[PDB]
Symmetry: C3
Subunit: 125 residues, 3 copies
């Protein structure tokens, strides 16, 4: 249980942070400026890449404030071996246009602990 | 032992019905009416002191999901000590009614990890 | 070790793609058609024994998510012993086709906790 290394791809990226010592996840921020109209989704870029911890995955989880405004998360499974610019799919299920500015908090990345079992085909259980 | 508090007598204590259930059932404490394409914050009138290296996920019941009732948000932080609400998204075509005492979700205590983040020049 | 059963020959063994993959790939055992703004329970014809202190999350493939396809429900409990279903929701603008054998989701074995609850008067 050592440090998770992350790379800022550009000067626009903000280091992920936990609000509080008991916060579930690390907050992710838009590196660019977007307009999402009602009934549309947009992949938002963080310009962050990280080497993910072992036996875990990163859940791109919703911030509750944005969810009460009708902003949900699409996809959001960051694999252990994924090394690219992390992106967040924001779904505007609200009634009017939602603006994403550079620096805006858009989601929380939770390091969810997972198992990698062997699968064995059987006749019955 | 996770301690919990009822804000009112209207709160139902979260239930666990079998050893192989993913978590605990959450129940509405109030009456609600959610029109099609609209979301509503359902108050459970339960607050709790959450265990270490976990978050509580407000997770969907399959039966409601199958009716087009999805879960908004739902990340209960370890140090969230307020009234637990369930954002129900009515993605069906009919008005969805929530009565006091109705099962609305399952709370799942999800084991997580809190790494230190160290910025580096490059990974690989 | 997890034991799984193919209910029909139309079922495909769940596989991980890479050693660092989060979930095991789930496939449609049948043909489906999903209208925009509608959902569909997809049958995998795979039933399995879930590990202890765990639940399977039916999680999205990010590629389908970019096309507007999302996952409904998806909590596979430890004592669920039936055909694993996948609720795909078509939140795109056009009809969605599912062909027998298509990759529809991934299953993530998510470690959980079964704590005791105790009512108190304050925290
Ligand atoms: Cl999850």
């Amino acid at each position: 249980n050592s440090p998770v290394r992350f790379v800022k791809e550009t000067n626009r990226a903000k280091s992920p942070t936990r609000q509080s010592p008991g916060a579930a996840g690390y907050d992710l921020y838009s590196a660019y400026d977007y307009t999402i109209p009602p009934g549309e989704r947009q992949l938002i870029k963080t310009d962050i890449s990280m080497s993910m911890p072992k036996f875990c995955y990163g859940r791109i989880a919703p911030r509750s404030g944005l969810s009460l405004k009708g902003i949900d998360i699409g996809g959001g499974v960051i694999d252990e071996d994924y090394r690219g610019n992390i992106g967040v799919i924001l779904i505007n299920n609200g009634k009017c246009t939602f603006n994403v500015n550079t620096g805006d908090r858009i989601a929380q990345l939770i390091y969810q602990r997972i198992y990698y079992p062997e699968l064995e085909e059987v006749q019955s259980l």
